[PDB]
Write a protein that binds this ligand. Structure first.
Ligand code: HEC
Length: 79
């Protein structure tokens, strides 16, 4: 699959232009940067980055294999 496909679900917590209030006050995804987003999204998928509220997101992003991980960051980096 590829990032774009996953994001469609992600809208639930991040909104379109990755800025809605997630599980409380959270940094907006809104073009942090592909580097940042990749490392953080990778962090979550791998389980290196996370926390209580992140648990849902962790499993959500966990579905992303590799193409997906990279592309999700790339996509989010222009959103
Ligand atoms: C709520 C139910 C969420 C779902 C589903 C998804 N994310 Fe999320 N995300 C959430 C929180 C609480 C935060 C914390 C950010 C902070 O530090 O305050 C985030 C943030 C991100 C980021 C930005 C990185 C950062 O700022 O630390 C990334 C890269 C991210 N989220 C990725 C991601 C993906 C790929 C999701 C859907 C495919 C997704 N999130 C859903 C809460 C929730």
């Amino acid at each position: 699959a590829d990032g774009a496909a996953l994001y469609k679900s992600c809208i639930g917590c991040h909104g379109a232009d990755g800025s809605k209030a997630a599980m409380g006050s959270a940094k907006p995804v809104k073009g942090q940067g592909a580097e940042e987003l990749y490392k953080k999204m990778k962090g979550y998928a791998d389980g290196s980055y996370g926390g209580e509220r992140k648990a849902m997101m962790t499993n959500a992003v966990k579905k992303a294999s590799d193409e997906e991980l990279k592309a999700l960051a790339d996509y989010m980096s222009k959103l």
